[PDB]
Symmetry: D2
Subunit: 338 residues, 4 copies
């Protein structure tokens, strides 16, 4: 009994797929959704239909102004302002800030005031809000914190992998590269982008050397690896799934077969679920729907020697991350209401 009641503000890509993960894992209960740029009737469409993840494997309709999903009514809102959503009346405790526009404790506090929702969870790396990665520092969550962060989805891939290698071979220093699928933030043709010019170029016809602090933010998830990690991104013409290309220096001399054994041991043990291990000839479509945060590709990895190796790990940047959002809630609820 006593499941966590959850609400969502920002029904984007990384906000609808989080909703999918909820009815799958069944670890929490969604009760509310708010998005002013999306109509209610539209919402059923975007849930039922998805070009990446297929149609919803349940029942979706409308009960009397409420979105019924797999036999569960959810109230819908559409306030331009985030502090104009009455979470209390829906019974929501934890709000998911997936609009990605209120990524600060000051802005996200707009959900918490007037006693409405207790904790706010930002589905992006935050500057002031304490970021968390379910693999590593999910336990660092103290009850006195309201607005958290689940870091970036590249971070959710690298950080768990970094922990294993570092804790077992000691990562002296490393540089990361993520071959990232394109995201909502890109253009179908050479369009406007007054800030990030490269990010405006046609998404299908370009390899776009983007940037990311995800690897640099691994330091915030793993403090022992602070300033020892950073890296950039390549955004390539694929709808979903991404891979991390880590190259680093280990403290202990270890052969690749040794590395494999440790990772295989982690993905089976304490990281059963966050980290996964395979030795198959996979590509970036064998992971569409993977709940894991990192899938170590043993085969594609290469070792120059025993102190300098290149590692590769996949992740569903959309759905793996979505699941880790659902996990962070369960943990909190487990921690605040117990």
């Amino acid at each position: 009994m006593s499941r966590a009641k959850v609400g969502i503000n920002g029904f984007g890509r990384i906000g609808r797929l989080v909703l999918r993960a909820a009815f799958l894992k069944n670890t929490v209960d969604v009760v509310s959704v708010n998005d002013p740029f999306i109509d209610l009737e539209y919402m059923v469409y975007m849930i039922k239909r998805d070009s990446t993840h297929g149609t919803f494997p349940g029942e979706v309709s409308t009960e009397n102004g409420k979105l019924k999903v797999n036999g569960k009514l959810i109230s819908v809102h559409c306030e331009r302002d985030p502090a104009n959503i009455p979470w209390d009346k829906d019974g929501a405790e934890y709000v998911v800030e997936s609009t990605g526009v209120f990524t600060t404790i000051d802005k996200a506090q707009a959900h918490i005031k007037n006693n409405r929702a207790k904790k706010v969870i930002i589905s992006a790396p935050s500057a002031d809000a304490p970021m968390f990665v379910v693999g590593v520092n999910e336990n660092s969550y103290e009850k006195s914190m309201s607005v958290v962060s689940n870091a970036s989805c590249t971070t959710n891939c690298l950080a768990p992998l970094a922990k294993v290698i570092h804790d077992k071979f000691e990562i002296v220093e490393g540089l990361m590269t993520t071959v990232h699928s394109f995201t909502a933030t890109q253009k179908v043709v050479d369009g406007p982008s007054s800030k990030l010019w490269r990010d405006g170029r046609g998404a299908m016809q370009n390899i776009i050397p983007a940037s990311t602090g995800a690897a640099k933010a691994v330091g915030k998830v793993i403090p022992a690896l602070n300033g020892k990690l950073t890296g950039m991104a390549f955004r390539v013409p694929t709808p979903d799934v991404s891979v991390v290309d880590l190259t680093c220096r280990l403290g202990k001399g270890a052969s690749y077969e040794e590395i494999k054994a440790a990772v295989k041991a982690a993905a089976s043990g304490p990281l059963k679920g966050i980290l996964e291990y395979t030795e198959d000839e996979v590509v970036s479509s064998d992971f569409v729907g993977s709940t894991s945060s990192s899938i170590f590709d043993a085969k594609a990895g290469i070792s120059l020697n025993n102190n300098f190796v290149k590692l590769v790990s996949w992740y569903d940047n959309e759905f793996g991350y979505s699941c880790r959002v659902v996990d962070l809630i369960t943990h909190m609820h487990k921690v605040d209401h117990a």
Copy 2:
């Protein structure tokens, strides 16, 4: 005597290429450009680097605060209010309206007001402004018209074909389908499009059924075929170039051999440069950068009997259409500034 002095508002896709089309024909003069979102710095980049048509053939730079393009200086503005764009100062007598917002004559007249833009040229269909398709209703244009429209890119492909077939076999009735490359109006991944839900889907993994106002608009350019034409569109994962698929009944008998030689005589004849004829094994990429408005494909056209055929005409939806913007001005300036 002189060349027409031209200005451009809305440095979009179908706007930057119109510019690129001016330094090629060199039939007119671009003097001013206006776009609030895209600064001068950015304008150079957007012009110089293009994922579809390649790097600009020439030296694009800045000088003394204004934009320069192979020894010609272009004044630059960032006014969000068309009424406050100073065309009068710049010397812009002709303005191309490529923002998508302004379509009404009384709307496009915010450019004309108060001693600046002589004629307003809307690079999009207008349901009140007299639409005109060069090569068809070209000379049908009157000097007493303050705002005109060039209609859609697609309709600029069908009409020059429609005319030929009509003016020789008389098109009884016909339905058109255009397999269209995606446009800036779409989403790279499943996104918000409250009006047109299907154009909210991932443009790169989907064949998206649309509906265009290009086919009946041929009735607006060719009155004889008014109401005899209509048809919808298909958006597919290519960055540029589209093809018209015209299915129609004829009034007179036709051997497809005749229709061929009819088009060939119209391509090299009066419609030289507007309508083109080909027999080659062409594919969409074979028309990137093409200046033709319609390129009839001989072998790809199918014919059921002597009266009911299916024609096929290619076009660069971006660059072919941007040329007819330029040519129209040479016609106006002929008629409208003399």
Copy 3:
């Protein structure tokens, strides 16, 4: 009261997806496969992981030199000469020819030579073998026919619809187009295509116009439409699913809504499972893994008048067809063992 014993020749994308359909429907028992390019280990890989239809839904492994799927054992062979495949020892009574090398009756008699397979179904449209379409002329199968084809997948889409529209309102004539996905017969980059130059172009870069008799082949399954139907094909950068574009002149006039009503009933009638009817804002990726032969889109298709209408219908060119292959065999098992 028995089940068909099925063998597969040609382990391409139809061959594998036919197998998936067999375990999804569980109406036939696949007992053998043959592909001189694909060994036992690889087959597992190709069955397990699939870029388009995701991972195999069930159990696949190997055992005692035999492929094992969901508990059923499947012999594996690598014969390049079809007359060298031991269909008798394998107990395969029905052989699926999907190599394309054997489409004629006599080139198909290899599997039947010297008491072996009883029947052979050609997944490719044939020149002499009796072509059929499930939902149109299933019951036209005689027990004496050794070779028999299942038309094309393009053919299997338009055929059910025609037996509705023409069956009710009569299309005096009609032309067809199919915006097809790309198939394994194509090239990643510009390459060789000796006899059909257009097909050897960048499949991801291009819209490729290709001829197809799959619309002329309608006359074979519906004699009444012999010479009344024919069409072409466009191939676009999408991995799977295609749409049929039918522009036909109807004898008995009907409004765009009257015809919708006709197709409704057909979806819930005897073709319940063949012809489907939808009214949703659908795009191509919605019908991935769909078992229908033809899904009519009421929102897409439009009508010029009452006698001249355009219809749009979707189909999974890979999986939908594979489903019909299965349905045909289990039907054949009914007759031979009646």
Copy 4:
């Protein structure tokens, strides 16, 4: 005086752009082509039409069963057996082996057999044949060397950069990843690929881990870094232009500015034409048609510290390589003739 007379075996993708780059640079003279699968008529269409690089810039016709290009004549052959090709009658001194079937000194000598061809160049890396990268070790060519290799596209990118680095700051140890466009060896959809399973997968649906022997191969070109550097590749859905992602440890402490200057100086100096330096916010498609082997991207490269950095260099994996083949030939005809 005399210009290099060249023949091409295998008019595939790479052998077809070599011809292109030849007439572009006009530094050598192509006199003979051979490809059994491509006849004269087809050969012309493959030149006039390119999905990636557009139409060829020149008059290409056929004079008397012979291919005429820009006024230069080229005799064609469809000899499957390279030892049957009359390179002597054609007067081809330097032959380009562009089919991967003849990549050893014994297997390549069929061109030189019986006094015709006097030098042969392998468009792919070779086992025993000495490889060369123009700008790095083209001066190690000896008049005695009858058969050579130009390594691979990727090697020609990594090497000019590595030379600069290792010479200025010394690369202690290094690892490389190349985000590479797909090539003719891949499939449009999941197809057979017995030796390399991942490459069987649909080229345009997946990110595909592959292996390149182009990083250790630098070791054969620069022994100083043999065993000290290696790497792999990710295959992504793009038609052309790849990028190299080089992570390495510098023996000398170097700041990023200090690195930026290191490359800018060599791109203007002796590596002018080979290595290029840029600071613009570019993407892959900005390099289609680039005649450079390596284009250093400053804004995309990063530095963890003064001794651990990540460098990025673009390259047209199709046409940058073909230009170097022409330079390898021009260099030999010099040395060969003296």
